[PDB]
Amino acid sequence: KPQAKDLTHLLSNESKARQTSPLKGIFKYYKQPGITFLGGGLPLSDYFPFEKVTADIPTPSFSGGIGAPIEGENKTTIEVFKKAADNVPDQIELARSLQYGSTFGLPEFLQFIKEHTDMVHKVPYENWDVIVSVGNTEAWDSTLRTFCSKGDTILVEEYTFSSALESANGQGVNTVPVTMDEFGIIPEKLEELMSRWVGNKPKFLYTICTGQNPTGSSLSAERRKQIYDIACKYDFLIIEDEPYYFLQMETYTKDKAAREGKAVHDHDEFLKALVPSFISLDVEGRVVRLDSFSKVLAPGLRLGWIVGQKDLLERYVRLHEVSVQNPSGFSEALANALLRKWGHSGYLDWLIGLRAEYTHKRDVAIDALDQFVPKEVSSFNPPVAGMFFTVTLDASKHPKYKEFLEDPLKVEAAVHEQAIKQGCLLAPGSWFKAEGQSSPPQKNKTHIFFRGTYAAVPLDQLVVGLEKFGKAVRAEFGL
Amino acid sequence: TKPQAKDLTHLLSNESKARQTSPLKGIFKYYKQPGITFLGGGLPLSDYFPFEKVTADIPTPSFSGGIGAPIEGENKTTIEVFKKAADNVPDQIELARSLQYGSTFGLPEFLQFIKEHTDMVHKVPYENWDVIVSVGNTEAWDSTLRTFCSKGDTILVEEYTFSSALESANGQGVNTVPVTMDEFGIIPEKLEELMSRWVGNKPKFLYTICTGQNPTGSSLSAERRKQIYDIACKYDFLIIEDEPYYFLQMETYTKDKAAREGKAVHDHDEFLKALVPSFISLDVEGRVVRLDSFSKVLAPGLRLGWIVGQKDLLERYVRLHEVSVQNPSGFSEALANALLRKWGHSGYLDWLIGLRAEYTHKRDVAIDALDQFVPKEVSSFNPPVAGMFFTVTLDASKHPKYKEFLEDPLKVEAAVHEQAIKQGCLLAPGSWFKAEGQSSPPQKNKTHIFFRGTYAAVPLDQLVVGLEKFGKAVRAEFGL
Ligand SMILES: [Cl-]
Ligand SMILES: [Cl-]
Ligand SMILES: [Cl-]
Ligand SMILES: [Cl-]
């Protein structure tokens, strides 16, 4: 494959200045006979008070559903002993996985994650790599520290993850909002914004492009292509923060009958149905992907990875060395053991069960919106991916709109309070509104929304909450 | 009833002060409130977490076979953490909770044990102290710089110190002004004089690895800690005690091998009395932050430590943690909680006493070998009372090529390093650890070298082989 473009000009001055420890240049002499190596700081693994760790995990192909009790034939016991000799093959024995080591990641874990990445995403340049993270939260903080200096500008979705904005605000990085419709970023308006751009270009575009938080939108293949062309034309990176990528679902249909027939029935059909990632389009190497186990296995793993071109990933590693250092050896050893026990085939089985479970929740959620929410003042886009749904309301139709000084946010607050009074809580959309100006600034409404999740609660309680939300909209809008 | 700490919020960076809670925190109160269907969150379903159980085999108090004895037979205890609270022994963090998103402060069972531990050892002398989790001292140091420093601010560091700690400061544009040391650590009299003359904005804090100092192997005496605390109070800066080696304190070195066993701590009371007072034990004002870690006590791969300090300063670390590291591994915290609660405070003290015995013996063999093999004509050594590092100091001015080297001690250091490599032994040159920096604006404005070794990394037979090789290297270069 071709080499990626040289994008080291997009690194921050601070990232570029980062150095390896001066004790790197005695590492060669480590574990090399003839030399008694006394120049290091490693504690003795002999004292690590963990002889083995075990977990009980479910068994592919998860035929009883991924939520089935982990018992009987749906229970296998994985074991990571301290010594390599005591392990089945391809494990990270605790004497090494609980020892300081390469900030890039443990070799068995990285090998598995690299194969997964290439199998799904077919990275179309030669010099790509994967490094470990302790989750997309830390990966995001590190991304800002690698590509942004104080006063720099990034592009964000005009509604996005509040935590992502808070990280940007703490590093003094301007978050200029990119206009969305119910299907996400509008490529025409991003092209227009960049065609007129005054002063230093934004360093990158930050996108939760699958199951977007909070809109529940997913960028179509067609919008991803157009946004990619903009990033190549104006020379900025795309950061795809993709913890919800494997919460893609069957397309929603009003027709209940035509649902059981829709499910994917094998691995090659599953992999073909997945929306192309930005990394799959990234012939230039200007995409950095933040991947996580948090929504796939468990948030408490504190384990993810970063996909991108070797020379940009090398700067993240320098930062990792003097910040988070490395993920938990327990997390990385146990994830390695689970993924190798399942193998790629069982991990694919797991992702297919995840797809089936979320497809059903979304079906129940959207059936309930269609049923209970009054259509005269509302709309909804059924999500194709993610844990989130939204309800859009025409605030201008609230009977107190004039008394509220034509302020849509007073209508949002009144519907919020009414929802709580009816015994249901959604997240007001305005809470996710991104604000920012470039330095210097670029030359220079009535619809509100609420974010819900169908991932959290039992589906009987999801229907109870949404009927109550329907009542709250009816009471407030006088229908 | 202890005093309140001083209000030190004026020492926070403007950036830290401006950090906010998630707009979503003010709907958490409705979470799991009866009558509310809570659809406002983003927690995935614990029903799918593919871990029914995690277990570990750990050694058994009082570790009478030594902390490194095989974990088998009576020296094997199986701890289990089930997914469901009902399946666990008491005080466990069931995987349904430990593997779910949670308070960035920490899991309450782990915090409770580590707070008890902290008070039992350090007796924090103000009321409004707390502890929060970290993913180790590396991250807690990165966080400390982001909490108390803006670009162009100044911190005080030990003249020779941890290269990773300086790399972290350099990355944040924080100036590292070196504080003069002798073989016993920071010289308080010189630090007081530096501060008495100080022009421009005061340093935000002093960064010290005060016990088993990297790389000097020094430990500040109780007396130096007192004098240094007084300077921090008088000039109003914080003390960041980065203390991963606190529990590698050892018996005082004596040449008399016969005297060693009788002098050793055996009991919990003797142990708690032999430990050097922490800065937090002195910290009547609440101007100390302690970075604590299990990396040198349990295993580096836990990626679990904690931060000790006054409530209002730790809350700012928590805001930063929420949008950086988030939380330590729930496997790490759940297994650490299980191990610590199974051993209890009594078993944990037993472990720390075994650790003290193990390190004391490694240090005895290392220093006995230095005494035996390193030529005394051009060398000296300070036996450490704590840590994993020893040093050998050399008078570069006595090297026969000193004139040929233009009286550059660093050329004598390079020559000894190369000769050591050629004799088959490798130590870390002292100059590699030297800190440099100037305040903004700058303050108005040596023949000895040293090497750092560790006695913790290799079997003790190989350590003696290595230090005899280093003696040969010093004898060859100095012509002795
Ligand atoms: Cl796979
Ligand atoms: Cl809005
Ligand atoms: Cl000392
Ligand atoms: Cl020096």
PDB file of N, CA, C and O and ligand atoms in Angstrom, chain A residues 159 408-409 412 428-431 433 445 447-449, ligand 2:
ATOM      1  N   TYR A 159     -23.710  19.811  18.638  1.00  0.00           N
ATOM      2  CA  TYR A 159     -24.128  19.096  19.873  1.00  0.00           C
ATOM      3  C   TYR A 159     -23.170  17.916  20.059  1.00  0.00           C
ATOM      4  O   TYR A 159     -23.042  17.105  19.145  1.00  0.00           O
ATOM      5  N   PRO A 408     -36.663  29.342  23.339  1.00  0.00           N
ATOM      6  CA  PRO A 408     -36.857  27.888  23.249  1.00  0.00           C
ATOM      7  C   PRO A 408     -36.375  27.163  24.520  1.00  0.00           C
ATOM      8  O   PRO A 408     -36.919  26.145  24.879  1.00  0.00           O
ATOM      9  N   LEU A 409     -35.352  27.713  25.182  1.00  0.00           N
ATOM     10  CA  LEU A 409     -34.762  27.058  26.380  1.00  0.00           C
ATOM     11  C   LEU A 409     -35.725  27.119  27.563  1.00  0.00           C
ATOM     12  O   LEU A 409     -35.632  26.226  28.399  1.00  0.00           O
ATOM     13  N   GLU A 412     -37.899  24.226  26.781  1.00  0.00           N
ATOM     14  CA  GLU A 412     -37.120  23.000  27.124  1.00  0.00           C
ATOM     15  C   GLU A 412     -37.206  22.799  28.643  1.00  0.00           C
ATOM     16  O   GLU A 412     -37.536  21.691  29.078  1.00  0.00           O
ATOM     17  N   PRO A 428     -31.916  17.251  28.604  1.00  0.00           N
ATOM     18  CA  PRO A 428     -32.123  18.371  27.693  1.00  0.00           C
ATOM     19  C   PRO A 428     -30.985  18.510  26.672  1.00  0.00           C
ATOM     20  O   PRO A 428     -29.804  18.559  27.034  1.00  0.00           O
ATOM     21  N   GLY A 429     -31.365  18.653  25.400  1.00  0.00           N
ATOM     22  CA  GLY A 429     -30.412  18.812  24.288  1.00  0.00           C
ATOM     23  C   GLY A 429     -29.482  19.991  24.460  1.00  0.00           C
ATOM     24  O   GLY A 429     -28.308  19.904  24.045  1.00  0.00           O
ATOM     25  N   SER A 430     -29.950  21.106  25.022  1.00  0.00           N
ATOM     26  CA  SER A 430     -29.159  22.364  25.027  1.00  0.00           C
ATOM     27  C   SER A 430     -27.910  22.133  25.891  1.00  0.00           C
ATOM     28  O   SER A 430     -26.897  22.771  25.661  1.00  0.00           O
ATOM     29  N   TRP A 431     -27.960  21.174  26.809  1.00  0.00           N
ATOM     30  CA  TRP A 431     -26.841  20.816  27.717  1.00  0.00           C
ATOM     31  C   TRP A 431     -25.604  20.359  26.935  1.00  0.00           C
ATOM     32  O   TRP A 431     -24.523  20.428  27.506  1.00  0.00           O
ATOM     33  N   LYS A 433     -24.779  21.615  23.839  1.00  0.00           N
ATOM     34  CA  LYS A 433     -24.466  22.654  22.829  1.00  0.00           C
ATOM     35  C   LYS A 433     -23.008  23.100  22.982  1.00  0.00           C
ATOM     36  O   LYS A 433     -22.651  23.510  24.046  1.00  0.00           O
ATOM     37  N   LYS A 445     -32.922  26.949  16.138  1.00  0.00           N
ATOM     38  CA  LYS A 445     -33.394  27.908  17.183  1.00  0.00           C
ATOM     39  C   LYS A 445     -34.691  27.386  17.824  1.00  0.00           C
ATOM     40  O   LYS A 445     -34.567  26.827  18.965  1.00  0.00           O
ATOM     41  N   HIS A 447     -36.589  24.799  17.338  1.00  0.00           N
ATOM     42  CA  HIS A 447     -36.693  23.352  17.675  1.00  0.00           C
ATOM     43  C   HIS A 447     -35.755  23.043  18.845  1.00  0.00           C
ATOM     44  O   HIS A 447     -34.624  23.539  18.855  1.00  0.00           O
ATOM     45  N   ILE A 448     -36.230  22.266  19.802  1.00  0.00           N
ATOM     46  CA  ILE A 448     -35.442  21.813  20.977  1.00  0.00           C
ATOM     47  C   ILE A 448     -35.439  20.299  20.860  1.00  0.00           C
ATOM     48  O   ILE A 448     -36.254  19.773  20.069  1.00  0.00           O
ATOM     49  N   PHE A 449     -34.591  19.630  21.620  1.00  0.00           N
ATOM     50  CA  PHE A 449     -34.662  18.168  21.712  1.00  0.00           C
ATOM     51  C   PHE A 449     -34.272  17.690  23.094  1.00  0.00           C
ATOM     52  O   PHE A 449     -33.701  18.422  23.890  1.00  0.00           O
TER      53      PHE A 449
HETATM   54 CL    CL C   2     -30.937  23.557  21.818  1.00  0.00          CL
END
